[PDB]
Amino acid sequence: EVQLVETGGGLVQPGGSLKLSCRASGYTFSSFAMSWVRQAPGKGLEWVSLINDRGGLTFYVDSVKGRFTISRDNSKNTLSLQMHSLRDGDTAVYYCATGGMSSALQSSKYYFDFWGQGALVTV
Amino acid sequence: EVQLVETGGGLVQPGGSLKLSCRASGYTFSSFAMSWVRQAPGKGLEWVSLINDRGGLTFYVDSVKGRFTISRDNSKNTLSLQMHSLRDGDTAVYYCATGGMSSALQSSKYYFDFWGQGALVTV
Amino acid sequence: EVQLVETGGGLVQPGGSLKLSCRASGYTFSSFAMSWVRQAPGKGLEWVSLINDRGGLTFYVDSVKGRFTISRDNSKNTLSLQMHSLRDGDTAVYYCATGGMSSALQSSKYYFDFWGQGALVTV
Amino acid sequence: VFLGFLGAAGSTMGAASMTLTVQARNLLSTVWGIKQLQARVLAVERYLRDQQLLGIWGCSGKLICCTNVPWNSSWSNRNLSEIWDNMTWLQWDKEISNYTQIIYGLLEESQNQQEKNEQDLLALD
Amino acid sequence: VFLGFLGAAGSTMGAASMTLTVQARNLLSTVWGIKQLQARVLAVERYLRDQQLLGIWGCSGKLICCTNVPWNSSWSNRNLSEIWDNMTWLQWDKEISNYTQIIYGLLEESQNQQEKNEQDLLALD
Amino acid sequence: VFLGFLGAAGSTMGAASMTLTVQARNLLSTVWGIKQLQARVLAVERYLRDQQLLGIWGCSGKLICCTNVPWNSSWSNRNLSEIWDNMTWLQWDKEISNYTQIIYGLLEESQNQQEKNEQDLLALD
Amino acid sequence: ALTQPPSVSGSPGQSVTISCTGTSSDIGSYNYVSWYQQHPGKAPKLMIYDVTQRPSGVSDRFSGSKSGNTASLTISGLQADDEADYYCSAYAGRQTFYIFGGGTRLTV
Amino acid sequence: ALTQPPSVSGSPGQSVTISCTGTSSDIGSYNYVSWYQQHPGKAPKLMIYDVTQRPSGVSDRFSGSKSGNTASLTISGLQADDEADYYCSAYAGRQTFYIFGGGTRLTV
Amino acid sequence: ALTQPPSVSGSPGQSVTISCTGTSSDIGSYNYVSWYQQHPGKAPKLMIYDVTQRPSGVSDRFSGSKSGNTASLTISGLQADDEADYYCSAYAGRQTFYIFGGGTRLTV
Ligand SMILES: *[C@@H]1O[C@H](CO)[C@@H](O[C@@H]2O[C@H](CO)[C@@H](O[C@@H]3O[C@H](CO)[C@@H](O)[C@H](O)[C@@H]3O)[C@H](O)[C@H]2NC(C)=O)[C@H](O)[C@H]1NC(C)=O
Ligand SMILES: *[C@@H]1O[C@H](CO)[C@@H](O[C@@H]2O[C@H](CO)[C@@H](O[C@@H]3O[C@H](CO)[C@@H](O)[C@H](O)[C@@H]3O)[C@H](O)[C@H]2NC(C)=O)[C@H](O)[C@H]1NC(C)=O
Ligand SMILES: *[C@@H]1O[C@H](CO)[C@@H](O[C@@H]2O[C@H](CO)[C@@H](O[C@@H]3O[C@H](CO)[C@@H](O)[C@H](O)[C@@H]3O)[C@H](O)[C@H]2NC(C)=O)[C@H](O)[C@H]1NC(C)=O
Ligand SMILES: *[C@@H]1O[C@H](CO)[C@@H](O)[C@H](O)[C@H]1NC(C)=O
Ligand SMILES: *[C@@H]1O[C@H](CO)[C@@H](O)[C@H](O)[C@H]1NC(C)=O
Ligand SMILES: *[C@@H]1O[C@H](CO)[C@@H](O)[C@H](O)[C@H]1NC(C)=O
Ligand SMILES: *[C@@H]1O[C@H](CO)[C@@H](O)[C@H](O)[C@H]1NC(C)=O
Ligand SMILES: *[C@@H]1O[C@H](CO)[C@@H](O)[C@H](O)[C@H]1NC(C)=O
Ligand SMILES: *[C@@H]1O[C@H](CO)[C@@H](O)[C@H](O)[C@H]1NC(C)=O
């Protein structure tokens, strides 16, 4: 029943910007940490960013630390990823997934349980 | 009316030591953060060190972190820069300037407002 | 009267494991910080690890940070060094010594006062 | 001030942990004058006893304080979901009151005391 | 102890902020015996209410505490120089007393509570 | 609670410093009713005066607190071994009571006050 | 990153094992190693989490194990649907959160 | 450091623009970019601070602007005195405080 | 590490000096420099600690001194037993605790 649909993948010039969004349904959105994981077309998966259940804590891989910004809105059940100063290495299919961490009052969820379809970004 | 006069520039052998001093007049010395900025003769400006208005906090560029020591005396309106284990890269005209930071109870002064004449150090 | 006898030096395959032990007598074991210092056969001394008098604080050189584990038992007057994922660079004679640090209520003991015999480890 | 006081008493422990300040603000305010004064003084010294207990651990000036005391399954073998999403704090207190003193003793025995001493020693190097 | 008490009351707020300990040390010390006891008890519980307010924010055991609550220009649109170099704390209190409760509510609403919860969660990874 | 109270009074200062919590837990609990109430109130405000002294230094919620005040050999020229392994806290208090106020003044004069102000300023950059 | 074999081959009915070598700081420090199955052209799917545990809707044919710094995924009773890219993932700590191994192609 | 053109040329009456490219961590993160004018053989003089603001005693001919990671100084109505070395400066954060760009020579 | 001469030569009755050059962060920052004597085939023995101080059971013939970033051990009245490997040691701070210099062979 869990569904995670990504919107905003497209073509952007080098040095441009792009806002990916991921809409979630079928579960309590506010009870899950979210993550963005990208796969370049011929290569394997790479973890991009992570956000906690409340949306207060944000973690990024060092390659996109100052450039990417993960955010969420629990009222709207949306997960946003703003991307600035896009380089050629960011060409990938981006997946929004549920997991990565959990609250102190929950069991450890160091894994990505439910994945999304994907959004293709090309620079 | 602001005047900042540097004294102590001269010739020193490699591995030697030198104390530059900067005497300030025409303004409240104790209300201003001070900085030392050096320019090598053919090259451009380079920030060396910074000290807050009270003289308690001292910051240095990593190239001179363990070697240089900035200090000040507000009673005497003097700003001292002690230099130890001088290398060949420290050959420059050193300027004492007012600014670099400010107290929490003041507007941001992330800039060097009033510069001094200069003191030539050669290694 | 101080005696520090090392046991457990021997031959171990690369990638193996080894537990060195050091038994102390002739002084108050619980009043002294302990250290492990290794000397490769043709080379000089190299500090490996350090543990405080109570056994709560453990410090290691970065080359063995995640691999070695220093511990002590004051009741038994024993100092243990567990070694995991042994590499070829760990071939050395290991000495247990008294010193390296001291409590805040004691004079500084930044030195290794009493050394042990030695334990030969070969990978 | 009194609004929401104990309102999450029947909530889950996880949900009642977001309302700790309403129950923390409410612990501090002839012969009958002496009675009222005795009540006020008792409340004051009780609050100070609780704050002293928090302070002899590492939990000074904190309403939620993480410690270095491991949880023992001899005190409760429930998983986090049963505790923070299925149970309330009153039920948890009823379940855990027999070990509370052991837990307090462990909190002030080794963790804060040896931590403090180790920070005394780490401020030397 | 009493020396310099309120001496910087007419100083600028910036200058009076260097004398906070003289005014902080002075907040803690038959029918008339009951009167004196009531005065002492009232002073004690008042001091404890102020310390509790400081502690439910991140300001426990601190006379100056920086927070994560942004300043709103609906409370005061003066620049730092007018506040810390031209005005006194009494004038500032007269100007800002209408919003003080909003500021206190914001101080304990989100910043310390969400900070604490986020530090609860950052002590997991 | 009362067990071990002052038991390390004749121990060395180093050994008595491991028992600070037994002596810290014991500082907090008609005409004779007024007498008992006066005793309780006095104990409360004394404890709060000591905690205020700890808090105006950097020592809030701590039984051992390292500071930035250097030791002056005009107060005591003994080496650490004579102090922490040969002397007791009562003898040390008898020896150092003449300078205690100077030490307290130095503790709250510059170190905590200038530290706090410098942390106010380091939270800008 | 985590070293993984680029390819593993098998036939239906046998049992294969895909390895995953990592540093001591990630697999040798934490028991959080997970395996995903990405069929070609579709999103990944969690097959194993926490080294050994299985999600709901995953057969017992997929199993996981760990030894020192090396984590292994055993697939028994191979079938046509098992042809996929099998990705390793490890929680590498607070600073670097997740490291993925290179995908492994299964041929049946 | 901040990338700056070594030279910019103009004639009296026109308007020139000296650029200053920096990393996202310094110019793209903080709105504290300042411009100094060093006439040959004398000390520098602050011409612009906080990107746009001007000191006292500085004409409106000197102006500043920022766009993303690039800060620009516009000098209008060129004159003989404008011949100088124009230095960029940016506040790069708590660890590295100030980074200066290479000096730019103005020829009139 | 600490730079040390690999060898120092002398005859009985003279006085020799073994030097030890280190970085400003270790010898120029802390007055904790110590010297050990390792006879061939046996454990090291502390000869000097805290730059100048001597243990119990060590003659006045062994002495230590420091100047800037360079610490020196002076051995006077050379004897047959003095033939050993003399090791320098310095406390390099909280992060890296102890750095040993390369051993120096004394020939008598
Ligand atoms: C008293 O106990 C009952 C359970 O016996 C609690 O009821 C729960 O209340 C919450 C909050 O209103 C409900 O959450 C809401 O649920 C729906 C989905 O069911 C959704 O539209 C909202 O997003 C929201 O999360 C929850 O369903 C409900 N659960 C039940 C009835 O099982 C009640 O909160 C307790 N009241 C107290 C402690 O005051
Ligand atoms: C009462 O208010 C008056 C202002 O109406 C305050 O007067 C100010 O006092 C300070 C401290 O003595 C003076 O600073 C000194 O000034 C001269 C330069 O003018 C210089 O020699 C010293 O370095 C020192 O900074 C200041 O000038 C003076 N300002 C005035 C009269 O405008 C006074 O401090 C207030 N007194 C209180 C709150 O007790
Ligand atoms: C009262 O003062 C006496 C000294 O006048 C203290 O006696 C000391 O007690 C400690 C603890 O029991 C003894 O330590 C033990 O000693 C032996 C070696 O002598 C060893 O078997 C144990 O490992 C242990 O460390 C210590 O020897 C003893 N020292 C003396 C008699 O010189 C006594 O603790 C004080 N009692 C108090 C403050 O209650
Ligand atoms: C838990 O409690 C039991 C007694 O109920 C005790 O024996 C055991 O050692 C405790 N475990 C730990 C890990 O402290
Ligand atoms: C606690 O122990 C007492 C001992 O008498 C017993 O009566 C009681 O049932 C116990 N409570 C729980 C919750 O185990
Ligand atoms: C400031 O206060 C006004 C009401 O006076 C409020 O609407 C506004 O959102 C506040 N601004 C911020 C940034 O909180
Ligand atoms: C605060 O609001 C009240 C509302 O009655 C008003 O009378 C008063 O003037 C206000 N004070 C300030 C300082 O704005
Ligand atoms: C120690 O005390 C004396 C007076 O007894 C004083 O003059 C001296 O300056 C003090 N030393 C330090 C380092 O503060
Ligand atoms: C402290 O000073 C007083 C001054 O009268 C003197 O009587 C006393 O002996 C002094 N005490 C010590 C311990 O020096």
**Residue ranges of the domains in chain A?**
3-123
Q: Which residue numbers of B have CB closer than 8 Å to E's CBs? A: 104-107
Structure tokens at I31: 């007055």
Q: Which ligand is nearest to the CA of E69?
A: 6
Chain C positions touching F80 (Cβ under 8 A) are: 105-107
Which of ligand 1's atoms lies nearest the C-alpha of D12?
Answer: 38
Q: CA I2, CA I91: separation in Å to the nearest integer?
A: 11
Report the distance separating Cα B87 and Cα B67, nearest Å: 10
Rounded to a whole number of angstroms, the distance from the CA of E60 to the nearest CA of chain D is: 5
Rounded to the nearest angstrom, the distance between the alpha carbon of B33 and the centre of ligand 2 is: 21
What is the distance between the alpha carbons of residues G12 and C74, in angstroms, rounded to a whole number? 59
Q: Tell me how far apart the alpha carbons of residues B95 and B116 are, in angstroms, rounded to a whole number.
A: 5
Which residues, other chains included, contact I71 with Cβ-Cβ below 8 Å and sequence gap of 6+? Answer: I19, I20, I22, I27, I33, I51, I64, I65, I88, I90
Taking CB atoms and an 8 Å cutoff, what residues of chain D touch I94? 125
Q: Please name which of H43, F45, H92, D35 lies closest in space to residue B2, comparing C-alpha atoms.
A: H43
What is the DSSP code string of A54-79?
Answer: SS--EEE-GGGTTTEEEEEETTTTEE
- Chain D closest CA to C104's CA: distance in Å? 5
Amino acid letter, residue A7? T
Distance (Å, rounded) from C-alpha A103 to C-alpha E122? 9
Residue C98 near residue C113, CB atoms below 8 Å:
yes
**Distance in angstroms (rounded) separating the CA atoms of residues E58 and E113:** 9
Give chain C as a DSSP string.
--EEEEE---B--TT-EEEEEEEEESS-GGGS-EEEEEE-TTS-EEEEEEE-SSS--EEE-GGGTTTEEEEEETTTTEEEEEEES--GGG-EEEEEEEES---TTS----SEEEE---EEEB-
Q: Are G77 and G61 in contact (CB under 8 A)?
A: yes
Q: How far apart are alpha carbons E23 and E7 in whole angstroms?
A: 9
CA atoms within 13 Å, Cβ hemisphere of F105 = 6
Distance CA A96, CA A116 (A): 5
In chain I, how many domains are there?
Answer: 1
- Measured in Å, residue B75 CA sits from the centre of ligand 2 at 17
Q: Point out the ligand nearest to the CA of residue F89.
A: 3
Backbone angles phi, psi at D26, to 5 degrees: -95, 5
> Rounded distance, CA H81 to CA E66, Å?
47
Structure token pair of residue C106: 């004691």
Helices D31-56/E31-56 angle, 10° precision: 30
Beta pairing, strands I7-9 & I104-107: parallel
Q: Do β-strands G62-67 and G70-76 pair in parallel, antiparallel, or remain unpaired?
A: antiparallel
Question: How many whole angstroms from D72 Cα to the centroid of ligand 4?
Answer: 6
DSSP strand E in chain G: where? Answer: 7-9, 15-21, 33-38, 45-48, 62-67, 70-76, 85-91, 98-100, 104-107
Q: How many residues does chain E have?
A: 125
- Number of Cβ pairs < 8 A linking chain A and chain E: 22
CA dihedral sign of residues H21, H22, H28, H34: negative
Contacts for E12 with CB less than 8 Å, ≥ 6 apart:
E84, E85, E86, E87, E88
Pocket-testing residue among E72, E101, E106, ligand 6, by greatest number of atoms within 8 A of Cβ: E72
DSSP for residue B43: S
Q: What's the start-to-end Cα distance of chain G, in Å?
A: 27
Overall fold of domain B3-123: Immunoglobulin-like (2.60.40)
- Work out the end-to-end distance of chain F between its first and last CA atoms, rounded to an integer number of angstroms: 48
Cβ-contact F8, F86 below 8 angstroms: no
H37 near H43, Cβ under 8 Å?
A: no
Cβ within 8 Å of residue F30, ≥6 positions away: none
Cβ of B107 within 8 Å of Cβ of E84? The answer is: no
**Gap between the Cα atoms of A107 and A103, Å rounded:** 8
Cα I51 to the center of its chain, rounded Å: 9
- Range list of H helices, A3-119: none
Ordered by start, the domain boundaries in chain D are 6-122
Residue D98, ligand 5, Cβ within 6 A: yes
Q: B47 and H32 in contact by Cβ < 8 A?
A: no
Closest CA to B7 of B92, B78, B87: B78
Q: In sequence order, what E strands does G15-58 have?
A: 15-21, 33-38, 45-48
Output the ligand 3 site: residues, CB below 6 A: F 10-11
Q: Cβ-count burial of D70 within 10 angstroms (0-12 exposed, 13-18 middle, 19+ buried)?
A: exposed
DSSP 8-state class, residue F72: P
* CB G90 within 8 Å of CB G30: yes
Of F17, F66, F80, the CB nearest to C107: F80
* Domain span holding position G88: 1-108
Instruction: State the Cα–Cα distance between residues H3 and H52, nearest whole angstrom.
Output: 19
Q: In the numeric block, which tokens belong to residue B121?
A: 């150090």
CA distance I86 to I101: 9
Between CA C114 and CA C72 the distance in angstroms is: 17
Helical residues (DSSP H) of chain F, grouped into ranges? 13-16, 20-24, 31-56, 80-84, 89-96, 100-106, 112-122
User: Measuring CA to CA, how many Å separate H42 from each of A110, B47, B118, D26?
Assistant: 61, 17, 8, 68
I1 C-alpha to center of ligand 2: Å? 57
Instruction: Give CA–CA dist G107/H9, Å, rounded.
Output: 66
Q: Report CB contact under 8 Å: C105, F79.
A: no
Q: Does I25 touch chain B (CB under 8 A)?
A: yes
Contact B122, H70 (CB under 8 A): no
Is residue G71 a contact partner of residue G22, using CB atoms and an 8 Å limit?
yes
Alpha carbon distances (Å) from F102 to B18, C65, F13, I20, I91: 38, 45, 21, 44, 35
State whether residue F19 is helix, strand or coil: helix
Longest dimension (CA), chain I: 42
How many angstroms separate the CA of residue E92 from the nearest CA in chain B?
A: 14
Q: How many CA atoms lie within 13 A of A112 on its CB side?
A: 33
User: Inter-chain contact B66–I24, Cβ cutoff 8 Å?
Assistant: yes
Closest partner residue to C95 among I30, I43, I103, by Cβ?
Answer: I43
3-state SS, residue G23: coil
> Which residues' Cβ are closer than 6 Å to ligand 6?
E 70, 72, 74
Q: How was this model experimentally determined?
A: cryo-EM
| Residues D108/D57, Cβ–Cβ less than 8 Å | yes
Write the single-letter amino acid at I21: T
Listed by the residue before each break, gaps in chain E with C–N over 2.5 Å are 29
C-alpha–C-alpha distance, residues E103 and E112, integer Å: 13
* Residue D123, φ and ψ in degrees, nearest 5: -85, 20
For chain E, say whether D37 makes contact (Cβ under 8 Å). yes
- Ligand 2, CB within 6 Å, residue ranges: E 10-11
* Burial readout E12-48 (b: 16 or more C-beta within 10 A, e: otherwise): bbbebbebebbbebeebeeeeeeeebeebbeebbebb
Tell me whether strands G104-107 and G7-9 are parallel, antiparallel or unpaired: parallel
G48 within 8 A of G34, measured Cβ to Cβ: yes
What the block records as the tokens of E66 is: 């920086």
Contact of H44 with chain A, judged by CB distance below 8 Å, is answered with: no
Helices (H) and strands (E) in chain E, counts: 7, 0
Is it the case that chain E and chain A have 3 or more CB pairs lying under 8 Å apart?
A: yes
CB neighbour list of residue H13: distance below 8 Å, 6 or more residues apart: H77, H78
For residue H85, the surrounding DSSP H or E stretch is strand H85-91
Instruction: Please answer whether residues A101 and A50 qualify as being in contact, where contact means their C-beta atoms are separated by less than 8 angstroms.
Output: yes
Find how far residue H20's CA is from the centre of its chain.
7
Tokens representing A93 are 């299919």
H-helix or E-strand containing A103?
none
**Protein residue closest via CA to atom 6 of ligand 8:** F74
**Residue E93: exposed, middle, or buried by beta-carbon count in 10 A (0-12, 13-18, 19+)?**
exposed
Structural contact between residues H86 and H36, judged by C-beta atoms closer than 8 angstroms: yes
- CA dist I103 and C42 (Å) reads 10
Say if residue D57 is exposed, middle or buried (CB neighbours under 10 Å; 0-12, 13-18, 19+): buried
Pocket test residue of D73, D74, D103, D107 for ligand 4, highest count of atoms within 8 A of CB: D74
**Smallest Cα–Cα separation from I25: which of I52, I51, I1?**
I1
For an interface test with D, give the residue of E36, E44, E48, E108 to mutate (most D CBs within 10 A). Answer: E48
Distance in Å, alpha carbon of D33 to nearest chain A alpha carbon: 46
- Distant-in-sequence, close-in-space partners of A99: CB < 8 Å, separation ≥ 6: A32, A33, A35, A109, A110, A111, A112, A113, A114
How would you classify residue D71: left for phi > 0, otherwise alpha for psi between -120 and 50, otherwise beta?
Answer: beta
CA separation for the pair E2, F50 (Å, rounded):
17
- List chain D residues with CB under 8 Å of I97: 125
DSSP one-letter code for D30: -
